[PDB]
Amino acid sequence: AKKWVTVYYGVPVWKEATTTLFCASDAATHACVPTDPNPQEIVLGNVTENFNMWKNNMVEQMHEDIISLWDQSLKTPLCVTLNCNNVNTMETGEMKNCSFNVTTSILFYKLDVVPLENKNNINNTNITNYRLINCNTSVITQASFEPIPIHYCAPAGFAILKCNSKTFNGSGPCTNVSTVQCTHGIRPVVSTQLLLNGSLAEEEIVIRSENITDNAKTIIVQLNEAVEINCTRPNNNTRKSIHIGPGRAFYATGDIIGNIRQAHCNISKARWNETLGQIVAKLEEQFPNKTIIFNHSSGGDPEIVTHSFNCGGEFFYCNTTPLFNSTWNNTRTDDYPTGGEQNITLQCRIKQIINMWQGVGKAMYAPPIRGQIRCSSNITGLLLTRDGGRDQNGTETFRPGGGNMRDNWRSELYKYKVVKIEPLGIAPTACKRRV
Amino acid sequence: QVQLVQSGAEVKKPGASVKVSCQASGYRFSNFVIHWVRQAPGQRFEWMGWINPYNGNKEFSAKFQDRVTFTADTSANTAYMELRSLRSADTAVYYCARVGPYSWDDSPQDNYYMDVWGKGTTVIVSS
Amino acid sequence: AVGLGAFILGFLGAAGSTMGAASMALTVQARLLLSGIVHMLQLTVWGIKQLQARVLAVERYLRDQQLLGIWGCSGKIICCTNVPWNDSWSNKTINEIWDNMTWMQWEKEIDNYTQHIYTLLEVSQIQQEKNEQELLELD
Amino acid sequence: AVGLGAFILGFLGAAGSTMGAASMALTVQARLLLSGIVHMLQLTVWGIKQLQARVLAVERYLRDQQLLGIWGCSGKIICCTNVPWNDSWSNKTINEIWDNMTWMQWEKEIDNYTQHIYTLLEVSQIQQEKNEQELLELD
Amino acid sequence: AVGLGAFILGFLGAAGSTMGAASMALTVQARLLLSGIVHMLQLTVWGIKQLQARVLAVERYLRDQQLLGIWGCSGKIICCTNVPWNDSWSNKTINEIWDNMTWMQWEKEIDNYTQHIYTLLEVSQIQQEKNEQELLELD
Ligand SMILES: *[C@@H]1O[C@H](CO)[C@@H](O[C@@H]2O[C@H](CO)[C@@H](O[C@@H]3O[C@H](CO)[C@@H](O)[C@H](O[C@H]4O[C@H](CO)[C@@H](O)[C@H](O)[C@@H]4O)[C@@H]3O)[C@H](O)[C@H]2NC(C)=O)[C@H](O)[C@H]1NC(C)=O
Ligand SMILES: *[C@@H]1O[C@H](CO)[C@@H](O[C@@H]2O[C@H](CO)[C@@H](O[C@@H]3O[C@H](CO)[C@@H](O)[C@H](O)[C@@H]3O)[C@H](O)[C@H]2NC(C)=O)[C@H](O)[C@H]1NC(C)=O
Ligand SMILES: *[C@@H]1O[C@H](CO)[C@@H](O[C@@H]2O[C@H](CO)[C@@H](O[C@@H]3O[C@H](CO)[C@@H](O)[C@H](O)[C@@H]3O)[C@H](O)[C@H]2NC(C)=O)[C@H](O)[C@H]1NC(C)=O
Ligand SMILES: *[C@@H]1O[C@H](CO)[C@@H](O[C@@H]2O[C@H](CO)[C@@H](O[C@@H]3O[C@H](CO)[C@@H](O)[C@H](O)[C@@H]3O)[C@H](O)[C@H]2NC(C)=O)[C@H](O)[C@H]1NC(C)=O
Ligand SMILES: *[C@@H]1O[C@H](CO)[C@@H](O[C@@H]2O[C@H](CO)[C@@H](O)[C@H](O)[C@H]2NC(C)=O)[C@H](O)[C@H]1NC(C)=O
Ligand SMILES: *[C@@H]1O[C@H](CO)[C@@H](O[C@@H]2O[C@H](CO)[C@@H](O)[C@H](O)[C@H]2NC(C)=O)[C@H](O)[C@H]1NC(C)=O
Ligand SMILES: *[C@@H]1O[C@H](CO)[C@@H](O[C@@H]2O[C@H](CO)[C@@H](O)[C@H](O)[C@H]2NC(C)=O)[C@H](O)[C@H]1NC(C)=O
Ligand SMILES: *[C@@H]1O[C@H](CO)[C@@H](O[C@@H]2O[C@H](CO)[C@@H](O)[C@H](O)[C@H]2NC(C)=O)[C@H](O)[C@H]1NC(C)=O
Ligand SMILES: *[C@@H]1O[C@H](CO)[C@@H](O[C@@H]2O[C@H](CO)[C@@H](O)[C@H](O)[C@H]2NC(C)=O)[C@H](O)[C@H]1NC(C)=O
Ligand SMILES: *[C@@H]1O[C@H](CO)[C@@H](O[C@@H]2O[C@H](CO)[C@@H](O)[C@H](O)[C@H]2NC(C)=O)[C@H](O)[C@H]1NC(C)=O
Ligand SMILES: *[C@@H]1O[C@H](CO)[C@@H](O[C@@H]2O[C@H](CO)[C@@H](O)[C@H](O)[C@H]2NC(C)=O)[C@H](O)[C@H]1NC(C)=O
Ligand SMILES: *[C@@H]1O[C@H](CO)[C@@H](O)[C@H](O)[C@H]1NC(C)=O
Ligand SMILES: *[C@@H]1O[C@H](CO)[C@@H](O)[C@H](O)[C@H]1NC(C)=O
Ligand SMILES: *[C@@H]1O[C@H](CO)[C@@H](O)[C@H](O)[C@H]1NC(C)=O
Ligand SMILES: *[C@@H]1O[C@H](CO)[C@@H](O)[C@H](O)[C@H]1NC(C)=O
Ligand SMILES: *[C@@H]1O[C@H](CO)[C@@H](O)[C@H](O)[C@H]1NC(C)=O
Ligand SMILES: *[C@@H]1O[C@H](CO)[C@@H](O)[C@H](O)[C@H]1NC(C)=O
Ligand SMILES: *[C@@H]1O[C@H](CO)[C@@H](O)[C@H](O)[C@H]1NC(C)=O
Ligand SMILES: *[C@@H]1O[C@H](CO)[C@@H](O)[C@H](O)[C@H]1NC(C)=O
Ligand SMILES: *[C@@H]1O[C@H](CO)[C@@H](O)[C@H](O)[C@H]1NC(C)=O
Ligand SMILES: *[C@@H]1O[C@H](CO)[C@@H](O)[C@H](O)[C@H]1NC(C)=O
Ligand SMILES: *[C@@H]1O[C@H](CO)[C@@H](O)[C@H](O)[C@H]1NC(C)=O
Ligand SMILES: *[C@@H]1O[C@H](CO)[C@@H](O)[C@H](O)[C@H]1NC(C)=O
Ligand SMILES: *[C@@H]1O[C@H](CO)[C@@H](O)[C@H](O)[C@H]1NC(C)=O
Ligand SMILES: *[C@@H]1O[C@H](CO)[C@@H](O)[C@H](O)[C@H]1NC(C)=O
Ligand SMILES: *[C@@H]1O[C@H](CO)[C@@H](O)[C@H](O)[C@H]1NC(C)=O
Ligand SMILES: *[C@@H]1O[C@H](CO)[C@@H](O)[C@H](O)[C@H]1NC(C)=O
Ligand SMILES: *[C@@H]1O[C@H](CO)[C@@H](O)[C@H](O)[C@H]1NC(C)=O
Ligand SMILES: *[C@@H]1O[C@H](CO)[C@@H](O)[C@H](O)[C@H]1NC(C)=O
Ligand SMILES: *[C@@H]1O[C@H](CO)[C@@H](O)[C@H](O)[C@H]1NC(C)=O
């Protein structure tokens, strides 16, 4: 029985390929077709396709075409020496709010001022002078930000293999693979150190990383309980409407209607115990005979250490130091309320000049909202990092970090890849061609 | 521990492009700002600018406006410094520094005092 | 549309089933087909994208059925050539390939050899179009 | 689109004309084709439904041209097999079938025998793929 | 879609290139394809017109591949017949046709003879379907 080569056409062999997926949403409105009214899904069966959420070529497709639509809605610096002082007053301590000098011819809260001093003889009077935080940055443009559940769909000729195994870890094989032409609701909300309005899991809290035994790799933690948060600004600002230029607007809002209550947040301490208690129970598995110590973040730029929000159109920077702040020797221990349970707060600062889109560098201006601001979201994910230190005595310290901006989207695109169908394949058999 | 290791010496002809590199080891390079200063034998130190590898924010001094460019690699934990033009007066020892941590009770620029330096590389224009 | 392999192309079998069981279940499924025995805005845009996915697969099918003419398999699904299967190309004993491996595991088995076998098929076809052509020139 | 039988499929003749006159008028109609001698909202929805009726007929055509490989008629319109026509299957004297009956009356004539002839075609094809295959194994 | 002749039909070569260079560059382009190596309102109306231009070209292709059955070239691209090329039909010495003339200049060369050669192909095919048919009736 001599074998012979035979070519077949219609083989189900797959090949991972890249493409330019198109958006889809209900209602930000350019190039996005409406959602599919018939979201078909076919379970393949006994297939084991090796996934890899870290080497995925879809996260780059989402990181791009989102700075692109962001730039389409932003199509100016005027850095002059300011002059201000402390405001006339869980309480606000120092929040400078004043007006500047000459605009063309003859209120910047706290993280957008840089102190200076002239060379005159006014040093005996203590006359301070400020400057904008992005005075020497490339382009400072000026403009509602509401996340819409964008759906990425595959083009003609390509498919999407969505796994369904509830025990994901990031890489390795899957056992329940199904094909879909689109995806679930993806909220493009930007934030650091915490993932807001994400997607909960189906089993216990799972962690995932490219190499858990490495320190530079981001450790994405997906929860299974929508921990709520209540961040609000109890102040009241009024639109100044300063016009500078031939038909140009600017809004350096501010009013004294009791500027003493500092904007903060509220997190359920009872719910926060059950979350971290299950996380340490999972981290102890990969890290045996060790103490999972949580600690304060790093330093440098103020937009790194703090959490980034978006509440109705204003950005909040909150000190996340009261969060995690413990040692956690064994599983589910080391509590600290002594019978309190009094809503652990987070003091927050508010910026106006935003170093928009981490990686390139092109700031923008956020127009303030007239009145009180109140928002509420669900803390569903967590970004972490491990400090590789030689003083490791069974205490591997973890920090919130924040990592790259792409890590906020790898926690939602970890379930699928884009494949191409190669239809021809060869195989040997016993037939022979007549000649 | 925190340590910055620079590259070796690089003797180049006047009009070339010297590429001085930095390397972060004991911390997360994507969270701190890196400074570059210059030191000539007998002269004083002189600031050359800084780069923010987190958001890509770059700021260089007016003296080196169109002569020195800054580039950084986040995934490799290395900061680079390119030079457009050269001159025999640029024969100096280049450094590399790292800013300090940010505290909750200070201005956004009170923590850029160059905590950790680096083993300074030297460049010669004409030997 | 025959075989039900969840894709437009790749109709010779379903992913997951073995190579042998996909062909034995194809002829059985083929007998039942020859005998013949048994909002608006979001609907007009997705009606087009389902057509563009089907028309593109038809154009790729009609193109590939004619590109196989370089191997003598012009317009065929299950062709048959005369190239000797080298034993160094994962021997595996024919009855063990169709009964154990699927199409996904078999493509990962000869991934380094598909570019070399594709060249031997073209060389063997030119010999057929040359030997069977000289026989007519003698008349 | 050839023959003009008012339908997309069923192009080998027009309903109403006899079996013989449909083939004699098909070759004459085929010679003229090879020689080449001679609102918006309600228009964009019905432009799609005319495409879905044509793309589906193309997919059914390309599928059936390959499903006929079980009978040896892979990729043919007017095939020809070697199964002996049994006289008990409505004898009718060949020249009287093509000149008197159309395709509608002929299908109602052998309606009870189409499921049996479809099985004899598959059995006779396997014998061809077995007898013509053993001749090559002897070399 | 193969050959890149800027049109849907007319895929056997690009207009402008010679007859010989279009076929030599077609097999080279075909090897790279078998190996597999490397507003909304104005968008939904023009998405349909691009489909109607592709579906019509597919229907004309599938129709013409079966109309060539009168010449024995049923389902082929580069066919080959047995009609003797008359020297009075612009002799031109075969190697000088493929290396100098393109497809546009060659059609203008035998424009008065295409209607006569199309009739000789049908006559020669009927002789093949008659001589090769009587050989089976003797058994
Ligand atoms: C995480 O998801 C939750 C759930 O969606 C989300 O909470 C939502 O926040 C928005 C923004 O505050 C709320 O939308 C507002 O709702 C009020 C009352 O219904 C409206 O009056 C508002 O409209 C006014 O304000 C707009 C912005 O200034 C104007 O453009 C508009 O013309 C009106 O003047 C506004 O629509 C929404 O109600 C909540 N949803 C829930 C269920 O609470 C939260 O913000 C998300 N988190 C993050 C970080 O994105
Ligand atoms: C493997 O993954 C598939 C999905 O790709 C899982 O099938 C899903 O199973 C759940 C429940 O087992 C289904 O939910 C319910 O289904 C009924 C069926 O009509 C529906 O009426 C309910 O409203 C609800 O949706 C889900 O629909 C189904 N999905 C699909 C596409 O079939 C399957 O369970 C997974 N198997 C394993 C072992 O993990
Ligand atoms: C969380 O991290 C912070 C820093 O990222 C830690 O704070 C600092 O930790 C170091 C290491 O122990 C302390 O340095 C040592 O301090 C002693 C004090 O006498 C000194 O003698 C040593 O030479 C050494 O420098 C440092 O003091 C400390 N910072 C402060 C302000 O106290 C912190 O310890 C970490 N959290 C936990 C729970 O460990
Ligand atoms: C955000 O605010 C918090 C609190 O206002 C700041 O965290 C505080 O950080 C310091 C050192 O980094 C901690 O101080 C040390 O604490 C130990 C144990 O209490 C004490 O024995 C030492 O003497 C020393 O004071 C302090 O505990 C810590 N506070 C909390 C509540 O954890 C944080 O620095 C602020 N964020 C930034 C970026 O500055
Ligand atoms: C994710 O899970 C898979 C399977 O559960 C892991 O793959 C196995 O990992 C073990 C040890 O890590 C190896 O001994 C096996 O050979 C692996 N099997 C396969 C098929 O690769 C994978 O390592 C996990 N990944 C992470 C990051 O935890
Ligand atoms: C994941 O990280 C671990 C440690 O963070 C790596 O293990 C080290 O690998 C290097 C290079 O091969 C060795 O020199 C070390 O000795 C290893 N550590 C130990 C404790 O043995 C591991 O290689 C990484 N894996 C991947 C795939 O990157
Ligand atoms: C944050 O605010 C929300 C309301 O916006 C709170 O949700 C309510 O919680 C109480 C119990 O604490 C429930 O009885 C209500 O039904 C909830 N509201 C709704 C609309 O369902 C939430 O508890 C707050 N979180 C914290 C930590 O204070
Ligand atoms: C924790 O914070 C929540 C805020 O959601 C507090 O709930 C408020 O309670 C007061 C007094 O009962 C009500 O007037 C508010 O309407 C509640 N807020 C909401 C959004 O409904 C809660 O009281 C706080 N916990 C403690 C112990 O004070
Ligand atoms: C967030 O929660 C804190 C509780 O930890 C609230 O602060 C208290 O609020 C009550 C009113 O319900 C006051 O009577 C207390 O004097 C407050 N105490 C402190 C220490 O602040 C706070 O009001 C909550 N904020 C929101 C927006 O719900
Ligand atoms: C944030 O979390 C809350 C609680 O998990 C979600 O509230 C649920 O909303 C659905 C639909 O409106 C209700 O059927 C549930 O009863 C709500 N939960 C509770 C406990 O009442 C809320 O939808 C989440 N927000 C987002 C944007 O996902
Ligand atoms: C960064 O921006 C400031 C402007 O805010 C520049 O400062 C100017 O410097 C020139 C040169 O001496 C003076 O004539 C201007 O009066 C300065 N502006 C102000 C407002 O005082 C500074 O030069 C910029 N940095 C660089 C490197 O160009
Ligand atoms: C502010 O503007 C006035 C002119 O309106 C000018 O005289 C004065 O010098 C300016 N002050 C500074 C600090 O530039
Ligand atoms: C906020 O300020 C505006 C204008 O100053 C005023 O009309 C409004 O009543 C204030 N809000 C509250 C809650 O008093
Ligand atoms: C942890 O330490 C104990 C004591 O040495 C040892 O018996 C145990 O095996 C260690 N755990 C692991 C996972 O090695
Ligand atoms: C954690 O933070 C809260 C609020 O800032 C504080 O009351 C508590 O003491 C901290 N826990 C520890 C162990 O320091
Ligand atoms: C946190 O959860 C653990 C789980 O058993 C429990 O032992 C501990 O008392 C809890 N602390 C609080 C404050 O609820
Ligand atoms: C897949 O495997 C399961 C058992 O693991 C079996 O019941 C099922 O029939 C298989 N499906 C296919 C398509 O082979
Ligand atoms: C089979 O592979 C071997 C590799 O050692 C090679 O020497 C031999 O020529 C190959 N035979 C054919 C027919 O390809
Ligand atoms: C492969 O299939 C055969 C049946 O043809 C079976 O006997 C054998 O056990 C299978 N191989 C494995 C590794 O299970
Ligand atoms: C192809 O060969 C290389 C080395 O020659 C090997 O590393 C690789 O695994 C082979 N491919 C497959 C699919 O096994
Ligand atoms: C149908 O029959 C009528 C006579 O009743 C005749 O005139 C006509 O030509 C026939 N049409 C066809 C298509 O046979
Ligand atoms: C023809 O039909 C008769 C029924 O009387 C049957 O006996 C005979 O075997 C059939 N012959 C063939 C060739 O089908
Ligand atoms: C042909 O078959 C019919 C029955 O359909 C029968 O009546 C007739 O006699 C048969 N003809 C001959 C010549 O036996
Ligand atoms: C059947 O057709 C023939 C012509 O071939 C004709 O002579 C005969 O009358 C027709 N039969 C009937 C019943 O009209
Ligand atoms: C098929 O046979 C049955 C009885 O054997 C008969 O009633 C029926 O009319 C036949 N079918 C046709 C189309 O004549
Ligand atoms: C057309 O002719 C020009 C020279 O006039 C040549 O450069 C070009 O390559 C030719 N293109 C084709 C497609 O033959
Ligand atoms: C070739 O053309 C000449 C015209 O002079 C004609 O007499 C001859 O019959 C033709 N031969 C063929 C085979 O067509
Ligand atoms: C070929 O035909 C041309 C007319 O097209 C004629 O002029 C030439 O002489 C012919 N060649 C020969 C060798 O007869
Ligand atoms: C036709 O092509 C040949 C090369 O095959 C060349 O020698 C000849 O010059 C060309 N004819 C003309 C008129 O240029
Ligand atoms: C066809 O012949 C006529 C005269 O017989 C002539 O005028 C015409 O030019 C010829 N056609 C071509 C394309 O040369």
Tab-separated table of C-alpha atoms and ligand atoms in Angstrom, chain A residues 236 238 255 257 371, ligand 13:
chain	number	residue	atom	x	y	z
A	236	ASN	CA	-20.515	74.742	43.302
A	238	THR	CA	-19.951	79.149	38.154
A	255	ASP	CA	-17.387	80.823	43.003
A	257	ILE	CA	-20.561	79.214	47.735
A	371	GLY	CA	-22.892	73.062	39.767
F	13	LIG	C1	-25.023	76.772	42.715
F	13	LIG	O1	-24.785	78.108	42.216
F	13	LIG	C2	-25.817	78.611	41.353
F	13	LIG	C3	-25.357	79.963	40.862
F	13	LIG	O2	-24.391	80.528	41.738
F	13	LIG	C4	-27.138	78.670	42.115
F	13	LIG	O3	-28.170	79.104	41.235
F	13	LIG	C5	-27.483	77.297	42.678
F	13	LIG	O4	-28.653	77.388	43.482
F	13	LIG	C6	-26.329	76.747	43.517
F	13	LIG	N1	-26.629	75.400	43.973
F	13	LIG	C7	-27.235	75.141	45.135
F	13	LIG	C8	-27.467	73.694	45.446
F	13	LIG	O5	-27.581	76.035	45.899
